[PDB]
Every structure is written in structure tokens, then in C-alpha cells.
Amino acid sequence: IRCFITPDITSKDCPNGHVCYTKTWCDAFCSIRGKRVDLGCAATCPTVKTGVDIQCCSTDNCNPFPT
Amino acid sequence: IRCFITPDITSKDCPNGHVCYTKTWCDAFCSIRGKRVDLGCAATCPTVKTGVDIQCCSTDNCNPFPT
């Protein structure tokens, strides 16, 4: 069977990477639910789409899900 | 560098699977944000932890993120 999967958030080695990042943006219900979150890794801090904020950092696992 | 990753929700072939599932449960702010969602695949509809509801279905991609 083929299904949609929501894989668990986990920590991964990005051998070519030098920063971790946290992208945040507002969806339809941002007022009550808060900003959406995307966590990743990259060689350099990536440029983002319109309406997206990004925070980059340079220690392992420096991008936990925001509290 | 090692970082936390939120992988994109996508559709995947589970060759040994016969159902797709949608697990839902309430976190701290379930009143305003709605239930949390976990999407996956399994051979049979899995038994779930306390406070978790599960919906299983048997067509490909029958488990989209709830609207």
C-alpha cells in the first residue's frame, strides 16, 4: 500500500552542512495556533520565500522545535 | 553538522502494508490548536496508546492530513 507518512522529527548528520536552521511562517490560523515550523540543515543559511523567517545556528542540534 | 529535521510529509510505498492510518490525540493546547496528527502505514491497523484515536483505511493515500 502507498500512504502519506509524517516521519518522526529526529536528528540527522548532514556531512556537508555547516548550519542548522529553523524556518517559521504564518498559515491561515497563525493568530491562535502560532507559526508553522520547518527544521533542517544546509551548507549556508538558505534564502527563504516571502513571509518566511529563518534562524540559523552553528552547533549540533541548535534548532530544536520552538517553545 | 547534525541537526533536527522535520522531513516533508510525502506518500511512500509500504510493500508489506495493507492499511494507511491516521492517529490523532490531544496535546496541552488541544482546545485552540486541535488534535495532533500522525500518518503512516501498517500490515494491520495498529493498536494505539491511551488517549489516541486511530482511523485505518485500505486505498492508496486514503490518509491525507485532516481538514
Curated annotation (Swiss-Prot), chains A, B:
<feature type="site" description="Binds to both neuronal alpha-7/CHRNA7 and Torpedo AChRs">
    <location>
        <position position="29"/>
    </location>
</feature>
<feature type="disulfide bond">
    <location>
        <begin position="57"/>
        <end position="62"/>
    </location>
</feature>
<keyword id="KW-0800">Toxin</keyword>
<feature type="disulfide bond" description="In monomer, partial">
    <location>
        <begin position="3"/>
        <end position="20"/>
    </location>
</feature>
<keyword id="KW-0008">Acetylcholine receptor inhibiting toxin</keyword>
<feature type="disulfide bond">
    <location>
        <begin position="14"/>
        <end position="41"/>
    </location>
</feature>
<dbReference type="InterPro" id="IPR003571">
    <property type="entry name" value="Snake_3FTx"/>
</dbReference>
<comment type="function">
    <text>Monomer: binds with high affinity to muscular (alpha-1-beta-1-gamma-delta/CHRNA1-CHRNB1-CHRNG-CHRND) nAChR (tested on Torpedo californica, Kd=0.2-4.5 nM) and neuronal alpha-7/CHRNA7 nicotinic acetylcholine receptors (Kd=13-105 nM). Also inhibits GABA(A) channels.</text>
</comment>
<dbReference type="InterPro" id="IPR045860">
    <property type="entry name" value="Snake_toxin-like_sf"/>
</dbReference>
<dbReference type="GO" id="GO:0005576">
    <property type="term" value="C:extracellular region"/>
</dbReference>
<feature type="site" description="Binds to alpha-7/CHRNA7 AChR">
    <location>
        <position position="35"/>
    </location>
</feature>
<feature type="site" description="Binds to both neuronal alpha-7/CHRNA7 and Torpedo AChRs">
    <location>
        <position position="25"/>
    </location>
</feature>
<comment type="function">
    <text>Homodimer: binds with high affinity (but lower than the monomeric form) to muscular (IC(50)=9.7 nM) and with low affinity to neuronal alpha-7/CHRNA7 nAChRs (IC(50)=1370 nM). However, it acquires (compared to the monomeric form) the capacity to block alpha-3/beta-2 (CHRNA3/CHRNB2) nAChRs.</text>
</comment>
<comment type="similarity">
    <text>Belongs to the three-finger toxin family. Long-chain subfamily. Type II alpha-neurotoxin sub-subfamily.</text>
</comment>
<dbReference type="GO" id="GO:0030550">
    <property type="term" value="F:acetylcholine receptor inhibitor activity"/>
</dbReference>
<protein>
    <recommendedName>
        <fullName>Alpha-cobratoxin</fullName>
    </recommendedName>
</protein>
<feature type="site" description="Binds to alpha-7/CHRNA7 AChR">
    <location>
        <position position="28"/>
    </location>
</feature>
<feature type="disulfide bond">
    <location>
        <begin position="45"/>
        <end position="56"/>
    </location>
</feature>
<keyword id="KW-0872">Ion channel impairing toxin</keyword>
<dbReference type="Pfam" id="PF21947">
    <property type="entry name" value="Toxin_cobra-type"/>
</dbReference>
<keyword id="KW-0629">Postsynaptic neurotoxin</keyword>
<keyword id="KW-0964">Secreted</keyword>
<feature type="site" description="Binds to both neuronal alpha-7/CHRNA7 and Torpedo AChRs">
    <location>
        <position position="65"/>
    </location>
</feature>
<comment type="subunit">
    <text>Monomer, homo- or heterodimer with cytotoxins 1 (P60305), 2 (AC P01445), and 3 (AC P01446); disulfide-linked.</text>
</comment>
<feature type="site" description="Binds to both neuronal alpha-7/CHRNA7 and Torpedo AChRs">
    <location>
        <position position="27"/>
    </location>
</feature>
<dbReference type="InterPro" id="IPR054131">
    <property type="entry name" value="Toxin_cobra-type"/>
</dbReference>
<feature type="site" description="Binds to both neuronal alpha-7/CHRNA7 and Torpedo AChRs">
    <location>
        <position position="33"/>
    </location>
</feature>
<dbReference type="GO" id="GO:0099106">
    <property type="term" value="F:ion channel regulator activity"/>
</dbReference>
<feature type="site" description="Binds to Torpedo AChR">
    <location>
        <position position="23"/>
    </location>
</feature>
<keyword id="KW-1015">Disulfide bond</keyword>
<feature type="site" description="Binds to both neuronal alpha-7/CHRNA7 and Torpedo AChRs, may be important for inhibition of GABA(A) receptors">
    <location>
        <position position="36"/>
    </location>
</feature>
<feature type="site" description="Binds to Torpedo AChR">
    <location>
        <position position="49"/>
    </location>
</feature>
<feature type="disulfide bond">
    <location>
        <begin position="26"/>
        <end position="30"/>
    </location>
</feature>
<keyword id="KW-0528">Neurotoxin</keyword>
<dbReference type="GO" id="GO:0090729">
    <property type="term" value="F:toxin activity"/>
</dbReference>
<dbReference type="InterPro" id="IPR018354">
    <property type="entry name" value="Snake_toxin_con_site"/>
</dbReference>
